[PDB]
Structure formats: C-alpha cells, structure tokens
Design a protein around this nucleic acid. Structure first.
Ligand SMILES: [Mg+2]
Length: 69
RNA sequence: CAAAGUUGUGUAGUGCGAUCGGUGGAUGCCUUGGCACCAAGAGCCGAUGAAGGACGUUGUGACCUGCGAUAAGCCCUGGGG
C-alpha cells in the first residue's frame, strides 16, 4: 500500500496523526539506512511521497478546494 | 724468390633509393552544434515577492537537467496506453 485519494475520507486530526506516524516511520528508515539495514530502499522514498499526499489533502481542505468533512 | 709498377678498400660512420614500421592527426565521409531566414504566435515579469542565484534534494559518489525539507517530485482534470 502507498496511500491514495481515500485519505480524503479521513478527518483532520487523524490525517495529522497519519503525518506524525509517517514521519516516525521515515525516521526509523533513515536510521536503518545509516546503520546498514533497510534492504527495502524504495519505501524510503514512498514514505516521503505519502507525507506529500497527506499535506496535499490537508492543504486542499484548508484552502477549500475540497469541502472539509 | 727479390725488384719495379698497377689496381683494390665501410669493421667508425654517412648519402641516395627501395621496403617495412613508429609518431603525428591532415584528408575524405559524417554530426545530438551552429549560421541566415520564412510563416504563425507571444510581446512583458515583480511585494501573491521577479530576473538571476546560493544551498539542498536520488537506494548510491559527483556533475548536468528538474525540483524545494510535500525537494528527478504531490493532487485534480483530459488524453494515452
Ligand atoms: Mg514575426
């Protein structure tokens, strides 16, 4: 899974929790990469892409491009 | 055999020719680059912060191109497969 437009079915607070969880996962991945672990390197970019998606949804809600749930 | 006389000279090197190579990158044939134009556009950008940059950004060392900590990319829409 890589997240998609179903993030628009979530609420603001749980989307922000999603942001925090994604940031923590990226932190762990970066530490693994530094320490020599993390064979799965593509996730290291996909997590940042997911953060971008969640910020996209939040900003469209904030700017009223899409009606806020 | 002696006497008198004649002629000859490449083991150092060199010249010329032929031949076989080396160096060199001319020539010929090209080209992801230029040059001069034609036709149609567009003729402004900027405090909603420009022109141009610095630094950063990739699974990984650099540089170029793109991008800006949402960082060779995020979303919507249409096309295409
Ligand atoms: Mg003209």
């Amino acid at each position: 899974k890589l997240s998609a437009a179903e993030l628009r079915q979530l609420s603001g607070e749980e989307l922000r929790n999603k942001v925090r969880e994604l940031k923590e996962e990226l932190f762990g991945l970066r530490f693994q990469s530094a320490t020599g672990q993390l064979e799965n390197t593509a996730r290291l970019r996909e997590v940042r892409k997911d953060i971008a998606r969640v910020y996209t949804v939040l900003q469209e809600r904030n700017l009223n491009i899409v009606d806020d749930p």
